[PDB]
Amino acid sequence: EEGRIYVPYVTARLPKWSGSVQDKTGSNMLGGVVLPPNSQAHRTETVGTEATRDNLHAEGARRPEDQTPYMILVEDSLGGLKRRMDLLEESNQQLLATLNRLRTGLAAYVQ
Amino acid sequence: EEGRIYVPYVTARLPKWSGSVQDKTGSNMLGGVVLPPNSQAHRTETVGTEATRDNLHAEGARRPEDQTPYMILVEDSLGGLKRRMDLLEESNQQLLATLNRLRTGLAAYVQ
Amino acid sequence: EEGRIYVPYVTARLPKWSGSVQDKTGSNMLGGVVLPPNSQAHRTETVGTEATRDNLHAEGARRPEDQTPYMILVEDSLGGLKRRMDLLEESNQQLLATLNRLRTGLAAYVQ
Amino acid sequence: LPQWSYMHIAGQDASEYLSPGLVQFAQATESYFNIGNKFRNPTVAPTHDVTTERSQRLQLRFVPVDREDTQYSYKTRFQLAVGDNRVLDMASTYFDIRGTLDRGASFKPYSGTAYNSFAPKSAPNNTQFRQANNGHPAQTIAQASYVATIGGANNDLQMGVDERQLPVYANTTYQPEPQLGIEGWTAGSMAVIDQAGGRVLRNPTQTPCYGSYAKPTNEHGGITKANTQVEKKYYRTGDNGNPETVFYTEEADVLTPDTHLVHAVPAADRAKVEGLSQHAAPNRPNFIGFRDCFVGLM
Amino acid sequence: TEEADVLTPDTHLVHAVPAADRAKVEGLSQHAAPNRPNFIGFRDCFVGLM
Amino acid sequence: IRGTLDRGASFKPYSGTAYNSFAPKSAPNNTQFRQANNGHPAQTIAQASY
Amino acid sequence: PPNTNTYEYMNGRIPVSGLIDTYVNIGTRWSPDVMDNVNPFNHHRNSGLRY
Amino acid sequence: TLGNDLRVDGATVNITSVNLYASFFPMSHNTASTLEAMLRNDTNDQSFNDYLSAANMLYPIPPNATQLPIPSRNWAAFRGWSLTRLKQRETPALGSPFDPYFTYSGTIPYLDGTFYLSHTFRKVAIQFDSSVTWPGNDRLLTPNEFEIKISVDGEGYNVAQSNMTKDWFLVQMLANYNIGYQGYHLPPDYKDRTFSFLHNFIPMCRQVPNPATEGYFGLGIVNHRTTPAYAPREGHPYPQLALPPHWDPRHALRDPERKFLCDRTLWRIPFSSNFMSMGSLTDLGQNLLYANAAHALDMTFEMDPINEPTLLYVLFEVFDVARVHQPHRGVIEVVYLRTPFSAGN
Amino acid sequence: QAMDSYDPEVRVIDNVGVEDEMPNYCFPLSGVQIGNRSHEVQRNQQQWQNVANSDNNYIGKGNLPAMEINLAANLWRSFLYSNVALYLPDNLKFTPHNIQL
Amino acid sequence: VANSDNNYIGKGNLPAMEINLAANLWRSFLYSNVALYLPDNLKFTPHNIQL
Amino acid sequence: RSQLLGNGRFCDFHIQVPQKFFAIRNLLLLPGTYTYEWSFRKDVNMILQS
């Protein structure tokens, strides 16, 4: 945090192959969906990946329109940390809501 | 976390100009707050930034003594995530205090 | 988060000495525990570190089979952030349990 | 290189690349108008027949070939091989000795004391003292510093408030902290403190406050003998009223590792009365260490 | 009994009672501590002036 | 170089205080304090010397 | 003030008790462990700065 | 004395007038003209060298890290290294007319000569062309890298009675005073100055109560009492438990500890075969004047971690020589040459 | 061969300060300032009774009695007075009352 | 005056105690640095103690 | 000398001891193979000083 010089190293030239960015949903020629080049669906090589609109893998949305452009992979990463933040905040909001419901029930019971 | 080996890259030379640190709040010539170079207050020029004590930007504190040395910008950053963590913890403490007060009130009402 | 290309720099060759991994507890010749190299304990030289099974440093666990392999030493680090995450999740669980028991008590008081 | 000679990095001495007239002028006008510092000398190191460049060591460690350790002397035999061309002077070859040495009870690396340096020498350490008859219950001298309302079960101290607006009572092991209480001179002098708490030594060895050290027995700063209970005693300065002072009397192995006793009372009446007036003294610093230049070690 | 604008130009307040209950009793227990010396002066050999 | 410099309010050429050093740190300076009720006349911690 | 670089902030802060006192490291010359990476020359008894 | 931002503290300086005072030696015009004519000659130019003749190379260190700098070209006439750690908060960006983000008064280590962090170096690795370590002839007691400090010392590799190793002690002794090979005697007074090694080398030794002892308790900072009744003080006189006794038959076992402290030192690693300084040009450096090849350098620093964001200050040392030429009557032609690290474009 | 020589701290007084940051707090010989006594009390059934023949307690509630000194300032003023004021020029000094010289 | 009985006025100068710091420190130094190192035959052992 | 090896009743010492004999301490030793057996005193009064 303190005294952070952003990009303090010497940057390597951008690789010229297809999959370089991390955790970014792509698409195939038929307008389908392809997993980012970090999911466990790229260790193997599925045959009909580039031949149908629907995804033949398991991880990922079944339709291209329902899939977020950037998927959150590796829970230890910053994306996973932000998702855990959102889950904790939603849980806190739900706890506040149920506490308020109990308070209003008690107030109604007072009368 | 595992096998961090911090600074595994090769470090480039520290730039000789001013504005390398990402989020330091700096100081004006006559005494003031100057937004960090990461901020959006440096995308243009303001004529009266120098030779002027009080700030001339929306961001920052109106007095140089009311500004923390390390302003937190970009919520995606570690500083922003830490700030949101602190806010969530404070909200949790507030919920705990409200629950404590409700329990004391219920105990008084019962007896 | 979005435009992240892991290892975008040029990696430097691994040093040939011991003490490169940032946060990793080790062991001496007779078992024992040695603190991670980034701990505030290798600034000095504890002569009796070798040839003993017990931990002569105040920091860390006392018995070798009770010290976790990766121990957090920086609150600013991702490990410290995750530790705070776990603590606050446990706090939410405790508040939920307290609210539940309070709700059962209120129900019993009503009936 | 010609460049180094031009820049006088390696070219030639100033007195022999300057003009002879300028050299003579500088030599003459040397007392008043110095010119020497304006010119550079190469000072080039030799480049050949100085270093071996044949992969040899600088420091060598010779482990002892044989050794014997008599209870009076320690003899070690080393065989040192001086290479085949290299030459050393015996101004090197220091003996590196590693071991453990105990300095004994006589060791004392500091003057004064280290536990109650600020305490009065003859002051008592909240000692509970026996009465003259030795049949009556022992009276106490301790001073109640921490203040709190006294109530609840068995009349403990009001240390604080927990999460609920409910009282919190002192943990008998350490909670009546000898460091917490009235801060500010107004309380107890202008404003009246109604109730206060403290901690007392019971069945003690009657030691002055100067040394008064006791090893911890719990991870909270408390001191008490193992398998020994702590009980509380109540006191008041008036009659027929709510008691003002609560004391948690505990028995601890209070030792004085640092100081000794000057004007010690006989042990027959040490613990009852007038053994409170014992005053301790610093312990004559000793400063045990190795000899000068390790003299006498060989 | 006179009114004076007494101030502390040398010292700062450590253990200051809350401002509300300051003029009353137990506001007398405030004990001041001297400010930390600063010794502002020119740099060694006027380094940085050039 | 000739000029005028104000070296800031942070300046403090000396350790300790210069005005009331001998005075006890927590001692009041012969002032008037109020009561808990605050309707009562303010009493004094004074000391008549002359 | 929230500005940690201000004289008021760095003056109106009191050290905790127990780190340094007339019992720590008694009998030896040993600089405090938590006061090694702090400028010894940023001291009020720096004779050069005083002069 | 405090590193407080003097700009926000209301400190300003106002300059009214600036003059310079030249001093002329009164010398008879005949000999003055003679000296002028002699010094206008092409063979009587005046040559000057920077004392700290080096190419300073500041390198940033993120907190709790070990660093990897790399140059990549020729090293003709090299002289040596000098490495030292500084805090980035205290290092200004003096490459700009004004540094708004400095916000720190007090001693400036980089440009004042105040190096209190030189003791936080564990070991230094030097490699050429990513294949050969520089002092690789089994020269040092640890051949692969210099080892400034050892935190375990399984062998007997420790010098004097401190944390530092024998090989690094010998390297420093040779680099600063040339003393290692002929014994270790205290250097003479005139050679031992402020910016030296033994003038600032302070060995220290403390011994802790061995927290592994049975019955030992590691107390917090709040339950650690001595003189409880003597901050305006308050409490009651009670037995204490701070500072468990180390001497006396009651000792609670023992555990010693050693470390050293150098406060105005530059860690020198001279570019000489035997680590001495037998001249300005070392034994090496002029062993590379043949221009046979240019070697890339890979340096590695393992160092103690501190929370403040700091910077490494390696000073690749060189020959920074300037030769002034005054041909005739008020024209000055000055030519510079930094041989190992040139600037000619 | 012992030259007359002033002390460079009394010829040129340098009020560097006194650094009297902490109090001094002289304390009585007795730890608790022996004064009025008190009676040991125990709870029998519901109210408080004095414990039998226990009336020699010496408990005094509150903080210890003590008096501040300001050691550093006292020493500094003693030094400065004794080394400068007594050597001040005679026209700046006065003879005490009821003393004949 | 009505309901004004909490004044704390003590007439006269402040009650203090003199110390003689200079002679006290000099005697402490002189004792602890000479008298303790006086030879054994001059020193005496205190009463009710064993050596 | 006492603070070099630390405080405390027990301690661990890592010392270097020189050669003090006049005919040896300055001798420039020629190539060969020599036995250099020496005996170190273990008498506590002579080794240590108080």
> Reduced to 3 states, what is the DSSP secondary structure of residue D257?
coil
Q: What resolution in angstrom units was achieved for this structure?
A: 3.3
- Residue H170 parent element (H or E): helix H166-176
Q: Enter the tokens of residue H34.
A: 């003679």
Backbone angles phi, psi at C94, to 5 degrees: -65, -45
What is the distance between the alpha carbons of residues K40 and K17, in angstroms, rounded to a whole number? 10
Chain F residues in contact with E29 (beta carbon < 8 A): 26
Query: 3-state class of E8 per DSSP?
Result: coil
Pull the structure tokens for residue D87: 């030459």
* Pairwise CB contact (< 8 Å): I67 & J22: no
Query: Which method, experimentally, gave rise to this model?
Result: cryo-EM
Phi, psi of J6, rounded to the nearest 5 degrees = -115, 15
Contact across the interface for I16 and F16, Cβ inside 8 Å: no
**Is the CB of residue H274 less than 8 Å from the CB of residue H106?**
no
Residue I51 near residue D140 (C-beta atoms within 8 A):
no
D267 touches chain H (CB under 8 A): no
Give the residue from chain C lying closest to A102, CA to CA.
Answer: C103
Among all chains, which residue has been given the structure tokens 């902490």? I22
**H or E element: which one contains A86?**
helix A78-110
Nearest residue of E to residue I18, measured between CA atoms: E34
Among F14, F25, F27, beta carbon nearest to I15 = F14
Question: Which of B67, B70, B71, B83 to probe by mutation at the G interface, max G CB count within 10 Å?
Answer: B67
CB-based contacts of J35, cutoff 8 Å, min separation 6 = none
Mapping DSSP onto H, E and C, the string for J21-49 reads HHHHHHHHHHHHHHHCCCCCCCCCCCCCC
Q: Are D245 and D235 in contact (CB under 8 A)?
A: yes
Asked if J46 is an interface residue toward chain D (Cβ–Cβ < 8 A), one would say yes
Residue D113: C-alpha distances to residues D109, G23, H245, H331, K9 (Å): 11, 9, 11, 75, 16
Query: Across the interface, do F24 and I68 touch by the CB < 8 Å criterion?
Result: yes
Strands (E), chain H: 11-17, 46-49, 54-61, 80-83, 85-87, 121-128, 132-133, 146-147, 202-208, 255-261, 267-270, 297-303, 310-317, 320-325, 333-338
Please, are residues C22 and B4 in contact by the beta-carbon 8 Å criterion? yes
- Tell me the nearest-neighbour CA distance from G27 into chain D, angstroms: 4
C51 inside 8 A of chain H by CB: no
Chain J residues with CB under 8 Å of D267 CB are: 48
Phi, psi angle pair for F16, to nearest 5°: 70, -165
Q: Please give the single-letter amino acid code of residue H196.
A: S
Token look-up 């009562």 returns: F40
- Smallest CA-to-CA distance from H237 within D141, I56, G26, D270 is with D141
E-assigned strand segments in I1-101: 39-43, 48-50
CB-nearest partner of E24 from F11, F25, F33: F33
Q: What is the dihedral of CA G9, G11, G13, G15, to 10 degrees?
A: 140
Distance CA D176, CA D159 (A): 8
Q: What is the dihedral of CA H209, H214, H215, H216, to 10 degrees?
A: 30
Q: Is E44 on the interface with G (CB under 8 A)?
A: yes
In the three-class reduction of DSSP (H, G, I as helix; E, B as strand; rest coil), residue D49 is classed as coil
Contact H218 C58 (CB under 8 A): yes
Neighbors of chain C by Cβ distance (3+ pairs < 8 Å)? A, B, G, H, K
Kindly compute the dihedral angle of the four CA atoms of residues H145, H150, H152, H158, in this order, to the nearest 10 degrees.
110
Record the tokens describing residue H294, joined without a space: 């240019």
Q: Would you call D114 and G28 a contact, using CB atoms and an 8 Å cutoff?
A: no
What is the C-alpha end-to-end distance of chain J, expressed in Å?
A: 69
In angstroms, the CA D239 to CA I55 distance is 11
In 3D space, the residue among H297, H303, H299 whose CA is nearest the CA of residue H148 turns out to be: H303
Instruction: List C-alpha distances in Å: J2 to D190, F32, F34, F37, J10.
Output: 20, 17, 15, 14, 21
Give the separation between CA D157 and CA D150, rounded to whole angstroms: 5
Structure tokens at H308: 């403040």
Q: What SS3 state is found at H166?
A: helix
Put simply, the answer to whether D42 touches H281 (Cβ < 8 Å) is yes
Residues in chain G: 51
Touching F: which chains, 3+ CB pairs < 8 A? E, G, H, I, J
Distance in Å, alpha carbon of H1 to nearest chain F alpha carbon? 10
C19–H255 C-beta distance less than 8 A: no
Q: Give the residue from F12, F14, F20 with the most E CB atoms within 10 Å of its CB, the best one to mutate.
A: F12
Q: Do chains E and D touch (3 or more CB pairs under 8 A)?
A: yes
Phi-psi region of H91 (alpha: psi -120 to 50; beta: other; left: phi over 0): beta
Query: Which of J4, J13, J17, J19 to mutate: most F Cβ within 10 Å?
Result: J4
**C-alpha separations of H183 from H24, H173, H234, K26, K37 in Å:** 50, 10, 58, 9, 20
CA F11: distance to chain centroid?
Answer: 19
Q: Which residue of C has its CA nearest to G36?
A: C43
Amino acid at H287: N
Q: Are D199 and D156 in contact (CB under 8 A)?
A: no
Q: How far is CA A102 from CA B103, C99, F22, H187, H246, in A?
A: 11, 9, 62, 82, 60
| Chain J contact present for I67, CB below 8 A | yes
- H49 neighbourhood in chain D, CB within 8 Å: 40
- C23 CB-contact burial (10 Å; exposed 0-12 / middle 13-18 / buried 19+): buried
Beta-carbon pairs below 8 A across chains B and H = 86
- Token reading at H217: 């308790």
Nearest Cα of chain G lies from the Cα of E14 at a distance, in angstroms, of 8
Q: Please spell the DSSP secondary structure of J4-21, one letter per residue.
A: --------SSPP-----H
**Is D109:D283 a contact under the CB 8 Å cutoff?**
no
Q: How far apart are CA H129 and CA H133, in angstroms?
A: 9
Taking the Cβ of residue B10 and every Cβ of chain A, the question of whether any pair is shorter than 8 Å is answered with yes
Q: Is B87 at the interface with chain H, CB within 8 A?
A: no
If DSSP codes are grouped into helix, strand and coil, which group holds residue E16?
A: coil
| Subunits adjacent to chain H (3 or more Cβ pairs under 8 Å) | A, B, C, D, E, F, G, I, K
G28 CB near a chain K CB, below 8 Å? yes
**Least CB-CB distance to E36: which of G11, G48, G49?**
G11
The residue among D158, D155, D164, D203 whose CA lies nearest residue D180 is D158
Beta carbons within 8 Å of E25's beta carbon, 6+ residues apart: D186, D190, D191, F33, F34, F35, F36
Put simply, the answer to whether K7 touches H207 (Cβ < 8 Å) is yes
- Among B89, B90, B60, smallest CA distance to B72 is for B60
**I and E touch per CB criterion (3+ pairs under 8 A):** yes
CA distance B73 to chain C (A): 15
Of H159, H183, H246, the CB nearest to K8: H246
Sign of CA dihedral D273, D276, D277, D281: positive
Contact (CB<8Å) I19/G50: no
Q: Look at B30 and H7 and tell me if their CB atoms are within 8 Å.
A: yes
**Residue D84 CA: distances (Å) to CA of D50, D63, H64, H180, K33:** 17, 20, 48, 21, 10
Judge whether K12 is closer than 8 Å to chain C, CB to CB.
yes
**Are C24 and C70 in contact, with CB atoms under 8 Å apart?**
yes
In terms of Cβ atoms closer than 10 Å to its own Cβ (0-12, 13-18, 19+), residue K39 is middle
CA-nearest residue to H209 within chain G is G25
Contacts of the segment G15-19: beta carbons below 8 A, 24+ positions apart:
G16/H221, G17/H221, G17/H231, G18/H221, G18/H222, G18/H224, G18/H242, G19/H221
- Chain E CB contacts of F33 under 8 Å are 23-25, 27-28
Asked if I74 and J21 come within 8 Å (Cβ–Cβ), the reply is yes
Whole-angstrom distance, CA of residue I79 vs CA of residue A65 = 88
**Mapping DSSP to helix (H, G, I), strand (E, B) and coil, where does residue D73 land?**
strand
